[PDB]
Each structure stands twice: as C-alpha cells, then as structure tokens.
Design a protein around this ligand. Structure first.
Ligand SMILES: O=c1ccn([C@@H]2O[C@H](COP(=O)(O)OP(=O)(O)O[C@H]3O[C@H](CO)[C@@H](O)[C@H](O)[C@H]3O)[C@@H](O)[C@H]2O)c(=O)[nH]1
Length: 608
C-alpha cells in the first residue's frame, strides 16, 4: 500500500513547521529511492500508524501539542457537585427482600448482557512476570481470573454468551495460550488487540526512538475498547452477513442488537467482586432507567481511585456526570481556597463523592448510539513523568492516554441518564500492589490491595455469602499468617470454594439450592471444602479438607450428600521465610507475591 512517493511526501510533511520531526532523518539521503531498509521500515511505521490512529502520526503530534499545552495549565472546574442519580446498593451479606428482588432481576438480565474485559495491562508492578488474568483468584483451586470471568459469563448467559477481551502486544499471545491450556471453548468470544502509540521525547512532541533507533511505543490506555468494538466485525455461515464497504461483513454491535441483547458490562482484569456487583447494578439500571451506571464504593481521601462527580469545566458548559481521576481531584482540592464552606470536605471520613471502581454498566442501545456517533473515539490526555521538581525534562518518554470511563463525556444530561451505584468497600477486591507497596500503604493506614488481601477477601466473600443463607460458620477474625516482614496479617480459613456448576450465578437463591438445610452443615473454622459440579449438600460435619465432585453437566441429575462425616489433617498456611535457601525452590512468583503458601497435607474426595 505505501509507495515510495507517499513515504517521501509524509517525510516532507513531518519536517514542516508545527511537526518538526527532522531529527528522525539525520544524515539520510534526499530521495526515498536512495534510502536503505531500516529507513524504509521507519517511514513505513510512520505511514501505517494512520491505520490504527485517526489522522495518523501528524494528527497524533498535533494532539500531543494540544495535550501538553493543556497539561502545563492547572486544571479547574467551573462547577463540581454530587451526581443527581446516586443509588445505595443493599448489603451483599444480608438476605433482605430488596436484595433478593434485585439479585433475581439482575440474574434475569444477565441472560441479555454482553461482557467486555480490559486485559491489555502489565502487572510487573506486582512482581509478577506473566499476564494479570493468569493470576489465581485463590490458590485453593488455582482458578485464574480469565477462567473465573469466562465461566461465570457462560453460566449466566449460556455457552454462546457474547464476550470481548481487549489485549495488547504485551498480553495477546499469552492470553490465547491460556485459553488453549484451560481448554475453554467460548463460541462468541472476540479477542481484540489494541495498538501501541508513539512516544514524545520532549515537551515539543518530538517522537522518541529506542536503543536500536526504532520508534518507541507505549500503551494508549484502556479507552481503546470502544474504537476496537466500533471497527469489530463478525462472519459465521448460512447467515445474512453482507460485506459493506465499511468492512466485511457485519458490525459486531449490530449482531449483538439483532440477537436481542440489551446491556453491556465492562470489567477489569483482577477484581472478582464484579460477579457480585454486576447483577445488582443491572437491576438498578432497569429500575431507574440509567443509560450508564458507574460502580462505586465509599472513597477514603487518600485512595488511588477516581471519583464520580457532576462537573462543568467551563461556566457556559452543561452538566456532565463523569469520573475525575485521583491526581486531578488532589490538584483541584489543593486549589479553590474560597470554594465555599467552613472546613475541609471530610465530615464522614469518606470523600464527598463516591469512588468509581470502573465496572461500567451500559444500556446497549444508548452505548451503540454514542459509539456510532463518536466512532469509539474518547477524549484523550497526557501525564508525563518529569525528572526535576520544576524543570520540564522527561524522565521517561511520554504517550497520549485514554480512559474507557471517559465515554461518559459523550452522554448529555438532556438526552441520557448517567448515574452511579454505591456498594460496600469489601466488594472492591483488586490485586494492584506488590507486598512492599502494600506494607508501605498499611503503615499509613491504607488498603493493601495485594495478592494476599485479594485471596483472603475472596474466601471471606464466600463465607459471608454462605452465612447470608443461614450456614452456621463460626470462625475467628484473627489472622493466621503474617506477610511482608510481619507488616500485616491475613486469614484464609475456613476455605469454601464452589464452582459455577455448583453455585450457578452465585446468587443467594443459587447458593440456597446447594444448602437446602444449612443448619445441618457444620464446617469447622480450619476446614477446606471444594465443591465441583452439580452437588447438593444436605448434612455434613467437616473437620479437615474435602473435595466433593459432581456431574460436569449443569442439567445432569445432582449428587446429594447426606449425613457425611469427614475428619483428616486438612490444610495449613505458612509464610514464606526470608531465610529461604532458594535451591529446589518450588516457590513460584505466584506464591512470592502473596507471601504465604498453602500446605495441602490431606484431602478426602467424594465422587459420583
Ligand atoms: O492500555 C491499557 C491500560 C490498562 N488496561 C486495563 O485497564 C484496567 C485498569 O488498569 P489499572 O492500571 O489497574 O487501573 P487504572 O487505569 O490505573 O485505574 C482504573 O481503575 C480504577 C479502579 O481500579 C478506577 O478507579 C480508575 O478510574 C480507572 O481509571 C486493567 O484491567 C488493565 O489491564 C488495558 O487493557 N490497556
């Protein structure tokens, strides 16, 4: 496609005033026909950047200039208030009539929901060299986040549930490898890889080169999903899929709407609470006719999560319900000395506005309308990392970024209802920080949000849900293992893990189908109970570790467990000692990032 004439034209265009990329061509011959392979390759990289970015490298440089201009200024909002449409979600551990009605409504709507997972990000910050969706949700069964999300979606929306995964050059191959290794067969899964974008060596938007004289590339952010969704097409067989000149053959959102789907949900890579959040949010979206629903928790003022606010950036601008990122809100709080009030905004211990968890719930029709109008394009930003305190020198080359929640900026208050649902903080269980960062954050009285806290929170969530339906679990709240040089402790036991065949959607009703007489099931605080397949447990006395396996098919007749008594050594947990020799280390980085290992000393199995 790119001829030598067009490559020379682009080179001349990029050397013009306002673009000033002549440093890319130092010592090069005048003509393209006289240039060698590495130069042709660099011009071709510049030329075909236009395929993945609107307007190509020249428009990328102009946008960079606009964004670095905007970033040099102190951000100001004309008006910043509580969103009009805020709704308080009921407790996930209380089986109230409202909770039952919302869970059942949400579970019904999950049959008509599209799921999107943003998994383009690296997790090297954790000390984990592999992809984040490969992390286990818990080490009792070692179920990956990828498997957890896909199996839950296929359980609530059938085998042919529409599922989208955004990948990157860093995660794509390994994501597909994991799908193969887990032997996960998802007929309507679409894996869309986001393209990296060029970087700016300086504040004048001069394109950066790497160590080998090639154009440095960096992620454009999780805002890439919408455009990736907008340009996505599908083709099957014996179906009316006309190849339009836009692309062959049919737009993917067209196939969704034609199939009868009514909602779309966006989730992130390492937050299991989404399976508890999504159904309630969906029900509340239907009850209050929300076009877009932000999943929110009460925010502590020192928290690396954004805040959902009603905003007007300029005095003439209309009201916009949108997310303000943590850094921007810190800068805004430092300013506005005479903003109106007596004392600092903290009368309850939490930020005035709720914290956005970035589990987004859209009405599919409204989402498609705004996606078609915007082509998936969302407002961009840039946030360079400077070396000196004031000197405008970049420590690392910078890149334009985007946020997938910023699509809310395309939703006018006149035509659309945009709101937020506030859940308990315990429902937000991400794995974002390493053990060192977690110890540092705990020293300041903040949330760890590490692998050990994520696994412990998963076990506690299962225990709280089961107690909500009357399972009499008596256990201590004292930690059983200290991690990160005795900085903080977590507890894991009792461990109770039910698979998607057993627990179905994970609703309280579905859990009550597994324990129809919960007063006759006595699980000791040190016990482990793994349940796989179609199992019903009527009566059980468990002192140790037990795996109950049932039929892998959901509609198969269930294995019923009555009057069972199991006693064995069961499992323990111990911390990873600093004095570990490291030779014959069966200790992987999965063990090392949580700071403990489970000893599976004994385990009973009931099959059939
Ligand atoms: O180019 C990118 C960058 C990120 N991600 C994914 O985006 C998600 C979130 O990235 P992460 O670095 O964990 O979070 P932030 O982008 O820093 O913060 C987001 O998530 C917070 C909740 O964890 C919210 O409070 C913020 O508003 C929201 O921007 C993860 O699943 C990443 O894999 C991509 O897929 N591609």
């Amino acid at each position: 496609n790119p001829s030598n004439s067009n490559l020379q034209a682009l080179r001349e265009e990029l050397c013009t005033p306002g673009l000033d990329q002549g440093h890319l061509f130092e010592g090069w011959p005048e003509t393209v026909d006289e240039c060698n392979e590495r130069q042709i390759a660099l011009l071709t990289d510049l030329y075909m950047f236009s395929n993945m970015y609107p307007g190509g490298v020249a428009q990328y440089i102009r946008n960079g200039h606009e964004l670095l201009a905007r970033e040099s200024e102190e951000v100001d909002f004309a008006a910043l208030e509580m969103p009009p449409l805020i709704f308080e979600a009921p407790s996930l551990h209380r089986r109230t009539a409202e909770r039952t009605a919302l869970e059942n409504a949400g579970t019904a709507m999950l049959c008509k929901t599209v799921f999107v997972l943003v998994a383009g990000g690296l997790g090297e910050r954790l000390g984990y060299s592999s992809i984040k969706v490969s992390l286990p949700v818990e080490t009792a069964t070692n179920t990956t986040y990828l498997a957890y999300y896909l199996r839950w979606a296929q359980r609530v929306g059938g085998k042919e549930v529409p599922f989208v995964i955004m990948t990157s050059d860093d995660t794509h191959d390994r994501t597909l490898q994991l799908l193969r290794e887990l032997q996960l067969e998802v007929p309507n899964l679409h894996v869309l890889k986001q393209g990296q974008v060029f970087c700016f060596a300086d504040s004048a938007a001069h394109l950066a080169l790497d160590e080998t004289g090639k154009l440095l590339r960096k992620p454009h952010g999780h805002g890439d999903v919408h455009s990736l969704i907008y340009n996505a097409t599908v083709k099957r067989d014996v179906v009316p899929d006309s190849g339009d000149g836009t692309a062959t053959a049919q737009p993917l959102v067209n196939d969704w709407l034609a199939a009868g789907y009514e909602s779309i949900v966006f989730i992130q890579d390492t937050n299991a609470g989404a399976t508890i959040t999504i159904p309630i949010s969906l029900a509340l979206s239907a009850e209050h006719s929300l076009d877009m629903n932000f999943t929110c928790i009460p925010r502590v003022p020192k928290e690396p999560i954004g805040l959902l606010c009603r905003t007007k950036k300029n005095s003439g601008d209309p009201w916009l319900v949108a997310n303000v990122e943590y850094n921007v809100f810190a800068e805004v709080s430092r300013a506005l000395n005479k903003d109106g009030g007596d004392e600092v905004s903290d009368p309850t211990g939490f930020s005035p506005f709720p914290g956005s968890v970035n589990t987004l719930v859209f009405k599919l029709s409204s989402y498609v309308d705004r996606l078609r109008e915007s082509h998936g394009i969302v407002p961009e930003f840039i946030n360079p990392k400077y070396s000196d305190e004031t000197r405008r020198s970049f420590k690392k080359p910078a890149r334009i970024e985007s946020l997938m929640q910023d699509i809310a900026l395309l939703f006018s208050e006149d035509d659309y209802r945009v709101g937020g649902t506030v859940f308990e903080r315990f429902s937000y269980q991400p794995v974002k920080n390493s053990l060192e960062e977690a110890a540092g954050l705990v020293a300041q009285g903040n949330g760890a949000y590490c692998a050990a806290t994520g696994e412990a929170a998963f076990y506690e969530l299962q225990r709280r849900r089961l107690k909500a339906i009357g399972l009499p679990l008596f256990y201590s709240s004292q930690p059983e293992v200290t991690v990160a040089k005795d900085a903080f402790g977590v507890r894991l036991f009792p461990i109770i893990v039910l698979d998607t065949v057993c627990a179905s959607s994970g609703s309280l009703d579905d859990l009550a189908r597994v324990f129809p007489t919960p007063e006759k099931v006595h699980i000791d605080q040190h016990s482990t109970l793994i349940v796989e397949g179609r199992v019903i447990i009527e009566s059980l006395e468990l002192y140790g570790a037990l795996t109950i396996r049932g039929p892998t098919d959901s509609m198969a007749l269930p294995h019923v467990v009555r009057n069972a008594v199991v006693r064995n050594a069961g499992w323990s947990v111990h911390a990873i000692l600093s004095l570990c020799a490291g030779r014959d280390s069966r200790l992987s980085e999965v063990d090392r990032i949580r700071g403990f290992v489970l000893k599976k000393t004994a385990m009973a199995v009931m099959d059939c």
